[PDB]
């Protein structure tokens, strides 16, 4: 029920079991569907592009991110200056909790506005610049559109505010945690001094001397730890002046750094662009028709289908460039020999030859030759009754094969292959999870010796959820209250050594002699 | 029992196969009214022929994805319709007569209908279907418009359906291959791999035809059901009690007679 089980490589170098207590609120946060989706994505990513060496590192990073997410969720969840502050924080928490509902409402508003705009009409006379008017007999749809546009802009503003109040803390925490790791265990700003090729590092250089550097990250003693680690090499006074520490006593800059980080953040940039187009809709209503493409980021199945084609975007660009190159080569071949045929004017007085200019012939080929279903010979003058019959029929047939069939079947093959590769990726991750234990790596064949052995092992002995719960339990529990094993694991975690995770061993493998 | 009869009638009326047969009869009756209603029964081949059913399952496997991509096509064609309605009203004219020109993009609904009707069904985008762009100041803009339409709307968004169908065929083939290989390589009841049984010649075949046959298990279950109680042996009573309590521990999992008694069998 509320009891957690784990296995570690203890100080005695043997697999040891540790028991602890799991909270109801934390468990509910665990079966929250958002956390379930995050776990699914993390498992897929690590299994697909992760080695066994850094797998524990990625797992611990994901556990820390999840812990911060559940802390934020618990904070925002709810079971004259003071009153206004309470109202403001309640409103902010409501926006944070209803961010997703607001986004869905924004999508519905975009669809409604587009549907109403689908009754656009053009009339030169007022209802040479044309006075645009919307035609409809009912009469209420113009005020409906005005109210919907105002309400949509409002919804976008609340969406941005909710994102800033909800997901920005995750980005800030991740960036601060990574900076702390690179400062302490790597000395990135102490010895390495990145060669101006890391704009992120250059930007994080500013926040070093800020007082409240660890605003969200739990380890507030990062400055003291890095000082103790790098004193004898760098200099105590110089470390103190670098970090802003008061050595003798042993935030505008931070706000600027945070604003830079959030402005660089891609999701915040996308929401800002959404708001900018929502505002520009008030200027030119058709700008609201550019929000309909938010379905790509909204609907999961649409996102997967579009990922199927963006998987090979580089290859598609390369093959489009190859098509442009080959069409240019055919354009040169035509410009040097076949100027007669590219004529599109029936009038004899003013013939229109579309290959006299190289740019014009290339444009003609790129425009009509590719978009024709039978090459360029079917599109331009007939080759019969000429001395160049064989040359021109060879030209047309080679164009048809190499330019239309093959070079528009390559795109279809790329898309089909991308669908296939994605399907095998999903199959491989599912089969690996089914056949191996994530934490230890021992195959399921050993565990299936006893009935339901693998299920019992993965639900009681080596549960990654239990490991995450134990880690958050250590973080929450006050120090000097740890048991011996808890202190051992806490010291290992602070030193960032993942030897305590069982690798290729388990309690059953260790004590089968007595268990049998 | 009127209540039981009402409940049974509700269940059978909800039943899908009974509903389909009722619809078959309704269309058969309506054939007497309008004979061409008998031409709607020809699609019963889909439910009749096994190979046709499999082929149609190959496309209904990704019906949700096909609906999603058709909606995406509608969205992108609407976006192109907006782009055309705001800038390119001149070109969408299909009337040669000068007295009464027919512009097919003055109305947003009309331009969207024109795009959905002819632009997608054209083999070369919409630029080949509507007025030529040459001899105009918007040459570059309109050629970019036409080429982007051709790539994003015809090539990619009608190759996605073909890719989906091919991928569905592939996934179904791997499903069949996987089930066949799993049945060949593992024992269904116990789960022990065939590698152990192939120690002796024909070992896996003998195990799956004499020791752990699912047909034999079903025959034993029906034998217990048929045989009168108080006539069961001790083992039969044990299995009957387990079945009544719905506990499947008696099924061998990860163990067998050979694994248990190889010490004496060897
Ligand atoms: N240790 C583990 N915990 C949870 N799910 C798993 N799937 C495979 N190994 C697992
Ligand atoms: N136990 C079993 N009975 C029948 N067919 C099988 N195929 C694999 N295992 C089998
Ligand atoms: Zn394990
Ligand atoms: Zn068996």
Would you give the distance in Å from CA B131 to the centre of its chain? 42
> Which residues lie near ion ligand 4 (Cβ < 5 Å)?
B 187, 189-190, 212
Q: At what angle do helices A406-435 and A313-337 cross, to 10 degrees?
A: 170
Q: Which residues of B touch A299 (CB under 8 A)?
A: 68
Indicate the burial class of A343 (C-beta count within 10 angstroms; 0-12, 13-18, 19 or more). Answer: middle
Can you say whether the dihedral through the CA atoms of A245, A246, A249, A252 is positive or negative? negative
To which H or E segment does residue A376 belong? none
Determine contact: A514 vs chain B, CB below 8 A. no
Contacts of the segment A251-255: beta carbons below 8 A, 24+ positions apart? A251/A210, A251/A211, A251/A212, A253/A206, A253/A207, A253/A209, A253/A210, A254/A207, A254/A210, A254/A211, A254/A212, A254/A213, A254/A215
Q: Is A79 helix (H, G, I), strand (E, B) or coil?
A: coil
Count CA atoms closer than 13 A to A389's CA, side-chain side. 4
For ligand 2, atom 3: residue with the closest CA:
B213
CA distance A470 to A21: 8
- Is residue A104 a contact partner of residue A295, using CB atoms and an 8 Å limit? no
- Looking at ligand 1, which atom is closest to the CA of residue A462? 1
Can you say whether the dihedral through the CA atoms of B58, B59, B62, B63 is positive or negative? negative
Count CA atoms closer than 13 A to A435's CA, side-chain side. 7
- Is residue A501 a contact partner of residue A8, using CB atoms and an 8 Å limit? yes
Q: Is A5 helix (H, G, I), strand (E, B) or coil?
A: strand
Breaks (C-N over 2.5 A) in chain A follow: 79, 127, 250
Residues 6+ positions from B224 with CB-CB distance below 8 Å: B232, B236, B239, B240, B243
Would you give the distance in Å from CA A338 to the centre of its chain? 51
The CA dihedral of A112, A118, A120, A121, to the nearest 10 degrees, is: -160
Q: Which residues of B touch A448 (CB under 8 A)?
A: 191, 254
Residue A184 DSSP class: I
Alpha helices in A346-405 (DSSP H): 358-364, 389-399
What are the φ and ψ backbone dihedral angles of B156, each rounded to 5 degrees? -70, -45
Alpha helices in A118-221 (DSSP H): 141-166, 168-181, 199-204
Number of H helices, E strands in chain A: 23, 4
Resolution of this PDB entry, in A? 3.5
Indicate the burial class of A375 (C-beta count within 10 angstroms; 0-12, 13-18, 19 or more). Answer: buried
User: Which of A168, A192, A369, A158 has its CA nearest to residue A274?
Assistant: A158
Residues A265-287: b if buried by 16+ CB within 10 A, e if exposed = beebeebbebeebbeebeeebbb
User: Which of B233, B212, B214 has its CA nearest to residue B224?
Assistant: B233
User: Which of A220, A209, A218 has its CA nearest to residue A246?
Assistant: A209
Count CA atoms closer than 13 A to A361's CA, side-chain side. 23
CA distance A488 to A477: 14
Residue of B nearest to A123 (CA): B106
Q: Is A53 helix (H, G, I), strand (E, B) or coil?
A: helix
User: Which of B258, B127, B60 has its CA nearest to residue A372?
Assistant: B127
- Is residue B107 a contact partner of residue A121, using CB atoms and an 8 Å limit? yes
Residue A324 DSSP class: H
Q: What are the CA-CA distances from residue A165 to residues A35, A141, A490 (Å)?
A: 18, 35, 31
Q: Is A375 helix (H, G, I), strand (E, B) or coil?
A: strand
Residue A304 DSSP class: H
Kindly report the nearest CA distance between residue A424 and chain B, in angstroms.
Answer: 9
Experimental determination approach used: cryo-EM
CA distance B171 to B43: 26
């Amino acid at each position: 029920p509320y009891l957690g089980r784990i296995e570690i490589m203890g100080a005695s170098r043997r697999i040891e079991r540790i028991y602890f207590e799991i909270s109801e609120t934390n468990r509910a946060q665990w079966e929250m569907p958002q956390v379930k989706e995050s776990k699914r994505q993390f498992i897929f990513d690590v299994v697909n592009e992760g080695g066994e060496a850094e797998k524990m590192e990625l797992f611990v990073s994901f556990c820390e991110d999840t812990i911060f997410e559940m802390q934020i969720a618990a904070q925002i969840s709810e079971p004259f200056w003071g009153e206004l502050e309470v109202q403001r924080v309640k409103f902010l928490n409501y926006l944070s909790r209803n961010f997703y509902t607001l986004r869905f409402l924004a999508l519905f508003l975009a669809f409604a506005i587009n549907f109403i705009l689908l009754f656009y009409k053009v009339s030169d006379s007022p209802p040479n610049m044309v006075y645009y008017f919307l035609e409809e007999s009912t009469g209420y749809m113009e005020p409906a559109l005005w109210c919907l546009s105002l309400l949509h802009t409002l919804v976008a503003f609340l969406c941005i505010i909710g994102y800033n109040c909800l997901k920005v803390p995750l980005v800030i925490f991740k960036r601060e945690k990574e900076l702390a790791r690179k400062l302490e265990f790597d000395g990135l700003y102490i010895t390495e001094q990145p060669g101006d090729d890391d704009v992120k590092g250059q930007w994080d250089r500013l926040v070093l001397n800020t007082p409240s550097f660890p605003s969200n990250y739990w380890d507030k003693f990062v400055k003291r730890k890095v000082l103790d680690k790098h004193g004898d090499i760098f200099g105590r006074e110089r470390i103190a002046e670098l970090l802003g520490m008061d050595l003798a006593s042993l935030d505008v800059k931070y706000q600027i750094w945070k604003f830079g980080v959030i402005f660089t953040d891609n999701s915040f940039l996308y929401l800002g662009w959404y708001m900018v187009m929502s505002l520009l809709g008030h200027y030119n209503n058709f700008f609201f028709a550019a929000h309909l493409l938010d379905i790509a980021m909204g609907v999961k199945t649409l996102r997967t289908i579009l990922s199927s084609v963006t998987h090979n975007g580089k290859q598609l660009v390369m093959t489009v460039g190859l098509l442009a190159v080959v069409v240019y080569l055919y354009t040169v071949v035509a410009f040097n020999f076949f100027r007669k045929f590219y004529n599109k004017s029936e009038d004899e007085d003013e013939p229109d030859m579309k290959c006299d200019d190289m740019m014009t012939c290339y444009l003609f080929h790129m425009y009509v030759g590719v978009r024709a279903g039978g090459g360029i010979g079917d599109e331009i003058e007939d080759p019969a009754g000429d001395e160049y019959e064989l040359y021109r029929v060879v030209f047309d047939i080679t164009f048809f094969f190499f330019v239309i069939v093959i070079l528009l079947a390559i795109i279809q093959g790329l898309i089909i292959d991308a669908f296939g590769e994605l399907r095998d990726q999903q199959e491989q991750v599912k089969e690996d999870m089914e056949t191996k234990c994530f934490i230890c790596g021992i195959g399921s064949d050993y565990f299936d010796t006893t009935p339901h052995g693998f299920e019992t092992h993965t639900l009681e002995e080596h549960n990654l959820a239990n490991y995450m719960f134990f880690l958050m339990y250590l973080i929450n529990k006050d120090e000097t209250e740890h048991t011996g094993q808890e202190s051992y694991v806490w010291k290992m975690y602070q030193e960032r050594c993942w030897d305590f995770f069982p690798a290729g061993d388990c309690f059953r493998k260790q004590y089968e002699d007595q268990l049998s």
